Amino acid sequence: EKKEKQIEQQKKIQMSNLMNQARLKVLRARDDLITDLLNEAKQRLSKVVKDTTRYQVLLDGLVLQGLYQLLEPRMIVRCRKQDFPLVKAAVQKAIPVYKVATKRDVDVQIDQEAYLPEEIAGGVEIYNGDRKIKVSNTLESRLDLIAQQMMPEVRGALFGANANRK
Amino acid sequence: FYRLKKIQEKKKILKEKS
Amino acid sequence: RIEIFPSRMAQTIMKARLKGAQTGRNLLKKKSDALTLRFRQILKK
Amino acid sequence: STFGYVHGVSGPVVTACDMAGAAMYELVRVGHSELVGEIIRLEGDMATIQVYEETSGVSVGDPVLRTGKPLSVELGPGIMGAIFDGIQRPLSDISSQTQSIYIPRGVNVSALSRDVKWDFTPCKNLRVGSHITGGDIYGIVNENSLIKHKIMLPPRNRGTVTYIAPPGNYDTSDVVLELEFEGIKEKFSMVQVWPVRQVRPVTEKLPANHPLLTGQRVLDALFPCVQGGTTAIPGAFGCGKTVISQSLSKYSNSDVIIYVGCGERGNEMSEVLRDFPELTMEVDGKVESIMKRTALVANTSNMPVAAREASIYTGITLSEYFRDMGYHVSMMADSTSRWAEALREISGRLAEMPADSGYPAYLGARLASFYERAGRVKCLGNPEREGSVSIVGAVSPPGGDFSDPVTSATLGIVQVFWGLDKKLAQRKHFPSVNWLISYSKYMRALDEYYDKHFTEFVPLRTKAKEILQEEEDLAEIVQLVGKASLAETDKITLEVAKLIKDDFLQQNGYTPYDRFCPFYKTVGMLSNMIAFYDMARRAVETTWSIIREHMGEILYKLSSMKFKDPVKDGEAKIKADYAQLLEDMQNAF
Amino acid sequence: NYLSQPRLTYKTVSGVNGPLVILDHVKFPRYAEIVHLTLPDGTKRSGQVLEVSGSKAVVQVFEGTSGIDAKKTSCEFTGDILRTPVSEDMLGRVFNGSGKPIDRGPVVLAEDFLDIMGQPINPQCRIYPEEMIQTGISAIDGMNSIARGQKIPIFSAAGLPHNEIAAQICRQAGLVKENFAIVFAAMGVNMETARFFKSDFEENGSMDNVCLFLNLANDPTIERIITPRLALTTAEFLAYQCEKHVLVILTDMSSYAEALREVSAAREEVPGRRGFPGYMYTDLATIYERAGRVEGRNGSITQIPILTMPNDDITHPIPDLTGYITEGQIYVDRQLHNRQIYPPINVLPSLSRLMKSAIGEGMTRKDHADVSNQLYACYAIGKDVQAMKAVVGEEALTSDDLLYLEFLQKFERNFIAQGPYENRTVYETLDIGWQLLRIFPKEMLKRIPQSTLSEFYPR
Amino acid sequence: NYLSQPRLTYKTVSGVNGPLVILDHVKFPRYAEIVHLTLPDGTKRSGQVLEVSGSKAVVQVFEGTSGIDAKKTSCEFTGDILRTPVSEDMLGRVFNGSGKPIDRGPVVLAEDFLDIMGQPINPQCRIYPEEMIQTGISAIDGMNSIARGQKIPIFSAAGLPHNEIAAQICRQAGLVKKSENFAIVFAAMGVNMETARFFKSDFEENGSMDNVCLFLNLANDPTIERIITPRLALTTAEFLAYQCEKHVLVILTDMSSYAEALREVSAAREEVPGRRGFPGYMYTDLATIYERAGRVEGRNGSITQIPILTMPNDDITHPIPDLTGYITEGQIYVDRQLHNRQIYPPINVLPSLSRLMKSAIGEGMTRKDHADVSNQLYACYAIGKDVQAMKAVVGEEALTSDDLLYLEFLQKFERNFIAQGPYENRTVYETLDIGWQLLRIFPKEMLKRIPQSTLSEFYPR
């Protein structure tokens, strides 16, 4: 009763450890199906950055979205090196719409000393005057926010919906 | 202890403004 | 079962009540040993 | 910035200004004498610092030199045989440097001296260009004949080797390893600095199975402790406290022994600091001192109270550093009641709310976060070693009552409680370990190892405990009724219980042959005392008077089994085999 | 529907004392907001905003303020409250105290994001628990029977086998004659306590439905606050939104309130008894009253929270306040543990308030409501008689009270003492209970009327 | 290391509340500086700086704040900390709390100036106490003997003669004849007028004044001076011991009256009181003055302490006899039971204990039978106390002949061994001879604590 009951327990631990590794393998397999979906989304946002007319009309509001959320007298725009003439039209277009909605008046500049790194796909990072408050509105920071709120929707629309709800 | 520490916390409030 | 209200003075009162009860054992246990020792030696007689 | 100014001192607390990039719980150096402090509140540009020493003569404008580190220990060679205080200042080195009998309170003397040279050897297949991760054994330093101080990588960093040192003698300031990472090659010496409040990272925790052989017979048989376990003992004035502490250092299976004297006394601390360097260790060869594998945290009540709070965390970090080398560390903290008085002083300093009998709200959390740092556990690194940390923490409750916010918080965390009794020390029952209130939660773990190694042992413990509990219940009625009205099956239990209390439980620590009995003797004497008890059951149920007078030589054989000298090792098992069959003869008569 | 504005990042801390960080120049701060602290060395810490005043916001980090700088740390304001990712595949795994996987596993794929504080159930649409759970223990099933949807704690102490009877009622939980999804919160436990529960659930093969949340003693104390909150919002998801019967085990609930005292004493809030906060009753009831069953759903949630009373005191603020919220308690005692009874359950301070609706003709049988009151009354008198024979003598008692001595040695050894793996049915328990009432005469059983004495006492 | 810069004089007081005077526009103030207050009528007062915050310096005046103006007073900042003028010539001089002479004498010439707070001793260099200090009281020397470097309080109450036995063990203390460099520092703290006059009329007028350093502190002179008084007394007792290499016995009375001075300056700093009104740092503050004892490695002097304190309402649970129990090494009890029985000194030896009395006594130290005659006198007094109640409740005739012998032992133990009179200096050999006279009334084979190797010589006489 020591030789039999121990091997019956150890087999039943062994069987239960088998279902644990089987469940964790198919759950980790569901990670890479979402991970490459976020990876190929990172590639397909770079193709939006390549063409100019869709990217700049994205970049007009995306600079203004950081502008309306910060609401400071002095603000500092910090951009990619390649997109620097493109953001200069985007900042200058976003000035007389800030004065329409709000009634302060901004004093933007664009930092030439420090830029975003080259591996960054696109977007912009807008600071305040004192370097203290920062709004990170890049394409890597905008993809991450939407991917968090849509994990309910990119699971049910992309795998099977659960049969037990409410 | 709670009453005496609360008095000392209020005594720093009036001292800071004045 | 509790008796009275805690005041910082009742604690000295309850320690005085405990002191008489602690010495109410040994002063009365040794009586119960003095009686039993004669009770055991009378039985041998 | 690099310095701050003082801007006001109001006691132990210094509200230092011009401190903009300082962190919380960071150590600074206040004043011209460089008094060590700790940043505890940070109100914008100003930080308030509680200073560990006596603020006296501190000006408004004195430089507050920030270190950028929290309260941490220096880990490296030069630590065995050394004596530190709670914040790790070497008390043996600080009396030779200054030639004074005091602690000068402005002394930033390093814990490991940078003048002694140590013979470093590389890891021999740790080639240049090899990838290395945190916790890998990087080298070996022969600190003593016993301790091979294995130099390791810190668990924070990682990289590829660009330079390794050739085998030779180096200081603790010499650069021994350079590692390339993505940005910048980092270089560092043989000594690593690790914070005391942060638990050392490790690969995975393991259940504890191997028992601690303390050497005492009541400790190794009835209430056993495992290496990787937590033990607590009462810390009263005299029961057996220094005896159990020195037997744990002398005759245990443990590779290093640390002792944390934590805010103890004036003259009880000097008793430890004079007796521990003159103890002796029995290695396979010739007798060596115990100080080759010992490191002391000596901390008296005169010392800073924020050093007595940190003395527990200093010790357990030294315990975890020698755990990571693969050794089996055993830690003795004496006492944890004087450490909890230091928590009540720090919380009473900052006007914290008293939760339970003065003691702060986090008393049970700091005790839980200390006993959980002990355990048998597989260390980080590729060479794949295994280590352990055992903790024996003394408890000094008021009046010997075990209802206290420190005592009840301790007994709910520890698993072994060797109950040492004052009245058993009055009758010279040595050791004084009481058996009614003592317990051990480490029986099942032990139960695995005892069927691979001793087998016939467990049932032996269960019935031997059944004798001792039935003896105390019977002894109440001996004075009320008498021994003449007692049954025949019960009175044979009483004599063998007295035989256990004199042969098994009583053990003289000065009688040479009894200093370190190993294990079979412990399974040996109990296999003959209970087989005699089991054979007496059927021999009574087949006269108790005729067996007591006729076994007086056979009972003398049982009462003299404790004199099997250490020149009798295999012969002692043969005498254990032959003394049993002499009982087998007289059963039929 | 979705927050799509980019989150702001502030490097504007102004004060840090204790666990509280004071951020300045925040623009429209929000109460109960979750934040993310980036240390100057790069480790990330989370935090809840506990007070906002104009532009200032007082946060408390969960992992402690050890090392938080003034110039270099950067706090990022997540624009919503603390919501956990809950899913159906959030089951069969082991998680830490905060939110993260432990067994080398992925993060959950988040079928929806539920607020961990939840929201209270309307009492108009909350149906009363009626069906009885047979736990296999005679002290539970016989005298203090629990219902499906009942909150009932195990009142224990340090050293008593409360974890052993916790795993026993998990293996043997069944309906009185489709399994229970067990969600397990381990809070402030030892490593050997967490290894005991891990190796027990991995032994009986129930680990395909166990939701074990472990939070050891080395893990920080502020994360013990959100530990039952995350363990009950998945049980709320599985029972009210996935139609499944859930059994929630909370341990240790003393480690919850001792961690609750540390945060309250650091915020300088008003204390109640023994330093515990005045809102301790409310905080204990926001994790206890999230139990029961609702009318439109076929799933339910029952709570068995284990707590160890300090110094064996039932008048301590831990078991007193949990006794005022829950529906009766189970009192595992110490004096019955010394006599080697495996459930050391003193039935006299034990209670089950929902036991009356769970016993009867349709539920178990006719004599359940009557033998439980009589076994209670004979144990109550015989224990007061036990305090009389210890002070006067074993021989000079009333002749009826010697049967009370013979009842108590048969009650504590045959009725409640059953072994770690024996699972008696409720009909087995009443049959053993009538055997102990057989040693009493028919007319001393006062609490039983004469009608059902005829059907059961002659046997 | 001379400081040579002149002293600044500030006329800039800004606030006065309680003992505290708040100054403004101070140029780099140190924390524990001594300042000199010059009043508008010309009277001079001293004071420490209590707290400094940038430009503000909050000083507390020693002698009180009454009459301190806001416009006309002038504070005189001395740049240094309070230092003790120490010498060997402070032996036979009566000083008051702060520093000043009291017996119409001169200022001490002071071959060194030492800080009153001191620096903590090295635990590695502190050696274990071995030899005995002779006090001349059989209740102390015979039963609860003290070592050379032991700290041991005397636990008393109000009205009991703990000041009369404080002056006794200062008047007849010595190291043991053993057939040598002995001093005594006496700190009298919070005493009355009559207790202060009793101390000077004793020592002085008894001839002991060749080695006494007696420090008075009455109830009139300020309560801040009660804090600097044992720091003063132990600074001079660290210069005589292991800087002049002599054995110094320090007597601190009343150590209960120290803590109300510690409680008073604590609330002056607006600090929240801890348990029972006493501050939380009291265990540290009692440690700074109790742990200035012991003997060191390379020096022949030593220092031992007898801190005499009164427990309030005879309660040991009070923090004054409790926090000194965690840190000192055994207690001596003055009870009201023996005091009302007219027994002097009223010391009961059942609850009293000396934790380092095993080390003190011995063969080379007093003589060989000391370990066994004290063990036997403690045993027969404990048994004799039990049979003393059976005479009351059972009967004088029912008790046996041996229990009658314990009755006759206890009547002579409390009247010949313990009771000794305030002027009888029994040496440690005269103490054991009285103890053997009270053991000779017992026959053999009852003295079970004494082995036969020593019982064979000392019993037949």
- Closest Cα partner for D381 from D70, D570, D158? D158
DSSP secondary-structure letter at F157?
-
Q: Does E270 sit within 8 Å of B9, measured CB to CB?
A: no
What separation in angstroms does the CA of E132 have from each of E174, E368, E435?
9, 12, 24
Q: Identify how the structure was determined.
A: cryo-EM
Identify the residue whose tokens are 């050696």.
F127
- Closest Cα partner for D235 from D360, D389, D342, D338? D338
Beta bridge partners of D120: D141, D168
Collapsing DSSP to helix, strand or coil, F302 comes out as strand
The C-alpha atoms of residue F102 and residue F218 are separated, in whole angstroms, by 12
DSSP secondary-structure letter at A119?
T
What separation in angstroms does the CA of E386 have from each of D301, E349, E415?
50, 17, 18
Minimal C-alpha gap between A143 and chain E (Å): 10
Identify the residue whose tokens are 């990072």.
A125
What separation in angstroms does the CA of E178 have from each of D445, E244, F438?
36, 8, 87
Residues 6+ apart with CB under 8 A from D189: D76, D171, D172, D173, D174, D175, D176
Which H or E element spans position D465? helix D458-480
What separation in angstroms does the CA of D572 have from each of D455, D506, D565, E447?
19, 20, 9, 68
Strands E246-251 and E301-308: parallel
- Closest Cα partner for E76 from A109, A72, A59, A141? A141
- Extended strands (E) in D249-313: 256-262, 280-281, 288-289, 294-299
Helices (H), F114-253: 138-141, 168-171, 193-203, 228-239
Q: At what angle do helices F282-290 and D336-349 cross, to 10 degrees?
A: 120
- Closest Cα partner for D250 from D212, D280, D284, D218? D280
The C-alpha atoms of residue D33 and residue D29 are separated, in whole angstroms, by 8
Q: Does C12 sit within 8 Å of F389, measured CB to CB?
A: no
Strands F247-253 and F302-310: parallel
The C-alpha atoms of residue D47 and residue D6 are separated, in whole angstroms, by 10
Which chain D residues contact residue E61 at CB under 8 A?
Answer: none
| F283 touches F326 (CB < 8 A) | yes
Backbone angles phi, psi at D8, to 5 degrees: 135, 130
Taking CA D210 as the corner, what is the angle to CA D209 and CA D215, rounded to the nearest 5 degrees? 140
DSSP letter string, D147-167: -EEEEE--SS--EEEEEEPPS
Closest by Cβ to D349, choosing from F242, F280, F296: F280
Strands E181-189 and E246-251: parallel
The C-alpha atoms of residue F21 and residue A10 are separated, in whole angstroms, by 79
| F320 touches F312 (CB < 8 A) | yes
| Overall size of chain E counted in residues | 459
Which chain A residues contact residue E8 at CB under 8 A?
Answer: 69-70, 133-135
The tokens for F240 are 């005589």
| F312 touches D288 (CB < 8 A) | no
Whether omega for the bond prior to residue D431 falls within 30 degrees of 0, making it cis, is: yes
Judged on CB neighbours under 10 Å (0-12, 13-18, 19+), D578 is exposed
Q: At what angle do helices F257-268 and F282-290 cross, to 10 degrees?
A: 130
The C-alpha atoms of residue A157 and residue A153 are separated, in whole angstroms, by 6
Q: Give residue D171's Cα distance to chain centre.
A: 30
Whether omega for the bond prior to residue E252 falls within 30 degrees of 0, making it cis, is: yes
DSSP secondary-structure letter at D17?
B
Q: Does B2 sit within 8 Å of E271, measured CB to CB?
A: yes
Check if D351 contacts B (Cβ < 8 Å): yes
Collapsing DSSP to helix, strand or coil, F313 comes out as helix
Q: Does E271 sit within 8 Å of D20, measured CB to CB?
A: no
Backbone angles phi, psi at E457, to 5 degrees: -75, -35
The C-alpha atoms of residue F347 and residue F333 are separated, in whole angstroms, by 6
- Reduce the secondary structure of chain E to three states and give it as a string: CCCCCCCEEECCEEEEECCEEEECCCCCCCCCEEEEEECCCCCEEEEEEEEEECCEEEEEECCCCCCCCCCCCEEEEEEEECEEEECCCCCCCCECCCCCECCCCCCCCCCEEEECCCCCCCHHHEECCCCEEECCCHHHHHHCCCECCCECCEEECCCCCHHHHHHHHHHCCEECCCCCEEEEEEEEECHHHHHHHHHHHCCCCCCCCCCCEEEECCCCCHHHCCHHHHHHHHHHHHHHCCCCCEEEEEECHHHHHHHHHHHHHHCCCCECHHHCECCHHHHHHHHHCCCEEECCCCCCEEEEEEEECHHHCCCCHHHHHHHHHCCCCEEECCCCCCCCCCCCECCCCCCCCCCCCCCCCCCCCCCHHHHHHHHHHHHHHHHHHHHHHCCCCCCCCCCCHHHHHHHHHHHHHHHCCCCCCCCCCHHHHHHHHHHHHCCCCCCCCCCCCHHHHHHHCCC
Which H or E element spans position F48? strand F44-53
Comparing alpha-carbon positions, the chain B residue that sits nearest to F270 is: B8
Whether omega for the bond prior to residue E4 falls within 30 degrees of 0, making it cis, is: no
Could you give the count of Cα atoms lying within 13 Å of A2 in the half-sphere of its Cβ?
Answer: 4
The C-alpha atoms of residue E276 and residue E279 are separated, in whole angstroms, by 9
Check if E308 contacts D (Cβ < 8 Å): yes
Beta bridge partners of E52: E57
Strands D328-334 and D377-378: unpaired
Domain ranges of chain F: 1-461
Question: In this structure, how many other beta carbons lie within 10 angstroms of the beta carbon of residue D487?
Answer: 10
Architecture of domain A43-157: 2-Layer Sandwich (3.30)
What separation in angstroms does the CA of A116 have from each of A62, A91, A122, D337, F196?
16, 17, 9, 57, 82
Asked whether the CA dihedral F22, F28, F31, F33 is positive or negative, the reply is negative
Q: Does B5 sit within 8 Å of E270, measured CB to CB?
A: no
Strand order from edge to edge, sheet including F44-53: F8-10, F74-81, F33-38, F44-53, F56-61, F20-23, F13-17
The C-alpha atoms of residue D371 and residue D230 are separated, in whole angstroms, by 7
The C-alpha atoms of residue D219 and residue D213 are separated, in whole angstroms, by 8
DSSP letter string, D87-142: T---HHHHHHHH-SSB--SS----SS-SSS-EEEEE-SS--TT-EE-TT-EEEEEE
Question: In this structure, how many other beta carbons lie within 10 angstroms of the beta carbon of residue F160?
Answer: 20
Amino acid identity, position F263? R
DSSP secondary-structure letter at D276?
G
Beta bridge partners of D329: D256, D389
Which long-range contacts link E24-29 to residues 24+ away (Cβ below 8 Å)? E24/E55, E24/E56, E25/A132, E25/A133, E25/E55, E26/E52, E26/E55, E26/E56, E26/E57, E26/E77, E27/A70, E27/A71, E27/A133, E27/E55, E29/E55, E29/E56, E29/E57, E29/E77
Check if F272 contacts B (Cβ < 8 Å): yes
Residues 6+ apart with CB under 8 A from F165: F137, F154, F334, F345, F347
Taking CA F104 as the corner, what is the angle to CA F99 and CA F110, rounded to the nearest 5 degrees? 40
Buried b (16+ CB within 10 A) or exposed e, F23-49: beebeebbbbbbbebbbeeeeebbbbb
Question: In this structure, how many other beta carbons lie within 10 angstroms of the beta carbon of residue D311?
Answer: 29
Model resolution, angstroms: 3.4
The C-alpha atoms of residue D78 and residue D173 are separated, in whole angstroms, by 13
Identify the residue whose tokens are 């039952």.
E228
Check if B2 contacts F (Cβ < 8 Å): no
Strands D131-132 and E74-81: unpaired
Residues in chain D after which the backbone breaks (C–N beyond 2.5 Å): 542
Which H or E element spans position D389? strand D386-395
Identify the residue whose tokens are 């502008």.
A67
The C-alpha atoms of residue A129 and residue F82 are separated, in whole angstroms, by 52
Tell me the binding residues of E: 353
The C-alpha atoms of residue D60 and residue D429 are separated, in whole angstroms, by 62
Comparing alpha-carbon positions, the chain C residue that sits nearest to F318 is: C8
Which long-range contacts link F359-363 to residues 24+ away (Cβ below 8 Å)? F359/F128, F359/F129, F359/F130, F359/F147, F360/F129, F360/F130, F360/F131, F360/F132, F360/F133, F360/F145, F360/F146, F360/F147, F360/F148, F360/F150, F361/F132, F361/F145
Amino acid identity, position A80? R
The tokens for D108 are 């930033």
Helices (H), F54-206: 138-141, 168-171, 193-203
Minimal C-alpha gap between B8 and chain D (Å): 11
DSSP secondary-structure letter at F129?
P
| D180 touches D196 (CB < 8 A) | no
Which chain D residues contact residue E266 at CB under 8 A?
Answer: 361
The C-alpha atoms of residue D203 and residue D380 are separated, in whole angstroms, by 5
Q: Does A71 sit within 8 Å of E205, measured CB to CB?
A: no
The C-alpha atoms of residue F94 and residue E206 are separated, in whole angstroms, by 85
Helices (H), F143-281: 168-171, 193-203, 228-239, 257-268
| E19 touches E60 (CB < 8 A) | yes
The C-alpha atoms of residue D208 and residue D448 are separated, in whole angstroms, by 10
Which chain F residues contact residue C30 at CB under 8 A?
Answer: 386, 389-390, 393-394
Asked whether the CA dihedral D457, D463, D465, D467 is positive or negative, the reply is negative
